[PDB]
Amino acid sequence: AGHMATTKRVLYVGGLAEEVDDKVLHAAFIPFGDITDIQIPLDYETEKHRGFAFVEFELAEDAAAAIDNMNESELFGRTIRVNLAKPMRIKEGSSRPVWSDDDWLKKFSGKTLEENK
């Protein structure tokens, strides 16, 4: 990409509350640049998200700014994390995060094994 070994157009968010829906994330990440999409997972044990989500921008340099301006910041009354995860529809990386981004991004982009192989 024009700034890194992978596209900055997509990024990760975590440490959120259970009510931090995709609409609140838009209002929480739009001032750094225009957004294109937002995504939130759901767990089978409660049908709620696990306090983390993804965001997508229409500008790669503005996505890098939103990572630096919201890392270790506050949202919903608690601390949150923000960093460049592996982009969707893709299966490689070389400067990827330290959390379980391998099995998580492969789960949403590769679909889960509960009805597929």
From Swiss-Prot:
Q: Name one GO molecular function term.
A: cyclosporin A binding
Per the UniProt entry, the effect of residue 50 to A is: No effect on interaction with KMT2A
Spell out which residues are annotated as carrying Phosphoserine.
Answer: 94, 100
| RRM domain residues | 9-87
Q: Give the result of residue 12 to A, as annotated.
A: Decreased affinity for RNA
Q: In which tissues is it expressed?
A: Found in all the examined tissues including heart, brain, placenta, lung, liver, skeletal muscle, kidney and pancreas.
Can the keyword Protease be found in this entry's annotation? Answer: no
Tell me the impact of changing residue 42 to A: Decreased affinity for KMT2A
Subunit architecture = Identified in the spliceosome C complex. Component of the XAB2 complex, a multimeric protein complex composed of XAB2, PRPF19, AQR, ZNF830, ISY1, and PPIE. Identified in a pentameric intron-binding (IB) complex composed of AQR, XAB2, ISY1, ZNF830 and PPIE that is incorporated into the spliceosome as a preassembled complex. The IB complex does not contain PRPF19. Interacts (via RNA-binding domain) with KMT2A (via the third PHD-type zinc-finger).
Annotated family = Belongs to the cyclophilin-type PPIase family. PPIase E subfamily.
Q: What is this protein called?
A: Peptidyl-prolyl cis-trans isomerase E
Q: Which organism is it from?
A: Homo sapiens
Shown portion of the complete protein runs from 1 to 114 of 301
